[PDB]
Amino acid sequence: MDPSQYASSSSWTSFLKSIASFNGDLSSLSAPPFILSPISLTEFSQYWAEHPELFLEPSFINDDNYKEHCLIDPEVESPELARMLAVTKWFISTLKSQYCSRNESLGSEKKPLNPFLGELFVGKWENKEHPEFGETVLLSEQVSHHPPVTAFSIFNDKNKVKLQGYNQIKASFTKSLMLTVKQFGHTMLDIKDESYLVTPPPLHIEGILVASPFVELEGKSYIQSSTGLLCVIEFSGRGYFSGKKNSFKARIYKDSKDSKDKEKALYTISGQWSGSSKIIKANKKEESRLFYDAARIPAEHLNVKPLEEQHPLESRKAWYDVAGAIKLGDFNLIAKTKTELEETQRELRKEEEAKGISWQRRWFKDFDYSVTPEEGALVPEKDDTFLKLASALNLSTKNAPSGTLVGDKEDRKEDLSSIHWRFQRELWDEEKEIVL
Ligand SMILES: CC(C)CCC[C@@H](C)[C@H]1CC[C@H]2[C@@H]3CC=C4C[C@@H](O)CC[C@]4(C)[C@H]3CC[C@]12C
Ligand SMILES: [Pb+2]
Ligand SMILES: [Pb+2]
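# lead (II) ion complex -> structure
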């Protein structure tokens, strides 16, 4: 049918009624074919680096060229600050990819495929037009199905820029049909010997009643550096304080201590993350410069091998039949192909439970950061980067919503675990079957 008839269709009405009895698992919703996306959530990890030049820029900034590299502030006080500005620009650049990609390729936000345990998604940005960049690799793996958790790493060996992180969400519907989404997890970016800890923001999906969903960010995101510098990004927009669609305000401070006083901000960046934003230094409101304009530089999609060469666990290969059925809009075929894959997985899980076997994660392992960790679990090293950055930010190390600070209600939750997925580069180095 035409999108104009989605909202009043029997299919959408039945979907909205299934929401009324939402059991907590989005996979139990009767989402009609027209609102389904043929893309699995394991693919979303690629949204962290669709602007290769911005991802790598911090590695090119040094003591001898930092002022010359900093266009937004040729008077930047230090290379560390120049790099924080670059990392902030990169983070902002990821937002359009993360939260707007489906609206552009599918017509609206849609329900993504719920990955199966063990699903993989790999590719690379060859950066052919820039030999100084080198190849940047993406490894994404579904480390959990119940609940869904995607772990990932994006790395550029040539310039020593590596990123790793994981993501999980907890979603619920309000009485007005707003889908509230709390993200869990975090991402760490290492630029040579300098590190940055990034926390994703909470968000909500609106437009469900009218059958034209879209993401609206809220809350805050943090970027804590090993240099002490901290960037606090606040999201607002329509229906909220600002009233401006996809708006944000980011402030950079000398340290988390100073972030308690907005007047201490070294820079203030404001605008729309899906559009243009300006930057003001200190408090010189008078003078401002363009910080980032999302419309000027198109996202660069990574290179993925042809389907004919993909391994059975690779996302697109595994979901091929379902993706095809979704593109056709065939109600019965979608149910048939999806059930086929998910039932095979059920059988696998039942065999594992009864046979005393556990699925072994491929390139990531779950580290227990608890004071009293599971006896067989891997534990963090003394010089663990997350521990040091979380300490600097006064961030909770528990499995609380992303960005939860020590002392917050979510951190004082009784018997909350502290398990975090970590990339194990050695496992990729000794990978003997998967290739790029
Ligand atoms: C779309 C309606 C009808 C059904 C529900 C769709 C929900 C499950 C979808 C739509 C928007 C999706 C989010 C879009 C973007 C991101 C950022 C990525 O880094 C992690 C996954 C995450 C957080 C997705 C989680 C799943 C999500 C919230
Ligand atoms: Pb709104
Ligand atoms: Pb384990």
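# post-check
The two ends are 39 Å apart (CA to CA).
Residues 366, 377 surround lead (II) ion (ligand 3) (CB under 6 Å).
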